[PDB]
Design a protein around this ligand. Structure first.
Ligand code: CA
Length: 443
């Protein structure tokens, strides 16, 4: 994530000589004085000096030297324009070198070959290696992001470090002055022992990271799992939900899971695109309140799920007619209830239709004769195991497309069968004792 600043024309890299002298030198990957890194969306810091590149004013031909890193300073913000060009944010003044025998980097109005810089060893501009906020693990910062650079025992560190430790674990300070604030966390990076944070289910080889100490938003939490090559927890099996109930049996604070309702066109879904085929809501949830689109697993309430406003700060859990060999047919003439429609499809040699891909769903709606005012049965049901939807034909449930607000599966309404209704062909659950069309499927 650290880079050298290279000027292709000169064949020279930027070199930090002193906090008040930023110049150039023969490129050297091992010369720490030449290494830099993005520490914010707009700040470029020196790795050797832990100081940020800036200017005294946004005026033509001033000296670019190192400054104390300041997230509020308009004079330390850089941005890429017209690809390689590197200029001060908000002005047509650029990172220049070479004019008028000046060995120091200068902010110049020209946009020639001496104002364009690439990441040494690549053909990309500096912005290609942009800053990625790093959410801490464990620690006492409640999941806050690393702050670079930070001061620890009167030394400045530009990256995660194991200083003050013998176990090689990498950590960082979430504030600039760690020695004073004492707020820290471990870095979401690889290091001998990093897997200690993950619980590996011996049944399915799936890994889970339980971050009960952090306090992040739903969207922040998801990025934490993502930056660890993972995603928010998805629960698609009873034995899975139970396992997490065991791991969190001793906790009490709610934990973000991947269950959200953020696609305003569809219903409940998992952030990792897992099929929403298992329900385990808390009494009173999902609530009728419109702002609550994100779901939390509450280990203090039997590990059941509740939906809350996505900005609430909580802990989180990471996780790490023929078509395609079948023949489909719609029945609208004589309408039947679910169990009767099921018998008919089985007498006709098949079963109630199962849907496993968007391609299969797109086929049913566009070809089989579907009309946007339809409401037809499908094989998705939870008659056998309440709250566990399976396909009537016994095939795996790998796909779900719920209508906005579905599956409601309200407490005492026995909504155990699923129908395909609406203009978009999405699904919904309802009582099984109602006459409706149905869709059969066979080989
Ligand atoms: Ca319903």
């Amino acid at each position: 994530r650290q880079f050298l600043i290279y000027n292709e024309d000169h064949k020279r890299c930027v070199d930090a000589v002193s906090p008040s002298a930023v110049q150039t030198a023969a490129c050297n990957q091992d010369a720490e004085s030449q290494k830099f890194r993005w520490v914010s969306e707009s700040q470029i810091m020196s790795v050797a000096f832990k100081l940020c590149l800036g200017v005294p004013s946004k005026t033509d031909w001033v000296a670019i030297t190192l400054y104390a890193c300041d997230s509020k300073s308009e004079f330390q913000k850089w941005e890429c324009k017209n690809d390689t060009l590197l200029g001060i944010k908000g002005e047509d003044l650029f990172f220049n070198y070479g004019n008028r025998q000046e060995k120091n980097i200068m902010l110049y109005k020209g946009s020639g070959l001496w104002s364009r810089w690439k990441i040494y060893g690549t053909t990309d501009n500096l912005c290609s290696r942009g800053y990625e906020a790093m959410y801490t693990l464990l620690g006492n910062a409640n999941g806050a992001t690393c702050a670079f650079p930070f001061k620890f025992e009167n030394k400045w560190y530009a990256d995660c470090t194991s200083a003050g430790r013998s176990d090689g674990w990498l950590w960082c300070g979430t504030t600039t002055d760690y020695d004073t604030d004492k707020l820290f966390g471990y870095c979401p990076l690889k290091f001998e022992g990093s897997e200690s944070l993950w619980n590996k289910d011996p049944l399915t080889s799936v890994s889970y990271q339980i971050n009960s100490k952090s306090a992040l938003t739903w969207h922040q939490a998801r990025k934490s799992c993502q930056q660890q090559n993972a995603e928010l927890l998805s629960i698609t099996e009873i034995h899975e939900q139970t396992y997490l109930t065991g791991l969190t049996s001793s906790l009490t604070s709610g934990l973000w899971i991947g269950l959200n309702s953020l696609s305003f066109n569809s219903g409940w879904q998992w952030s990792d695109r897992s099929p929403f085929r298992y329900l385990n809501w808390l009494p009173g949830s999902p609530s009728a309140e419109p702002g609550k689109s994100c779901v939390s697993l509450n280990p203090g309430k039997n590990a059941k799920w509740e939906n809350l406003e996505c900005v609430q700060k909580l802990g989180y859990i990471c996780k790490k007619w023929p078509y395609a060999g079948h023949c489909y047919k719609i029945h609208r003439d004589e309408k039947k209830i679910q169990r009767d429609a099921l018998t008919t499809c089985r007498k006709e040699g098949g079963d109630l239709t199962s849907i496993h891909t968007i391609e299969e769903l797109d086929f049913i709606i566009s070809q089989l004769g579907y009309e946007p005012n339809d409401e037809l049965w499908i094989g998705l049901n939870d008659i056998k195991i309440q709250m566990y939807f399976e396909w009537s034909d016994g095939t795996p449930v790998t796909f779900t497309k719920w209508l906005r607000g579905e599956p409601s599966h309200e407490n005492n309404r026995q909504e155990d069968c699923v129908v395909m209704k609406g203009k978009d062909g999405y699904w919904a659950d309802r009582g099984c004792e109602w006459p409706l069309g149905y869709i059969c499927k066979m080989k």
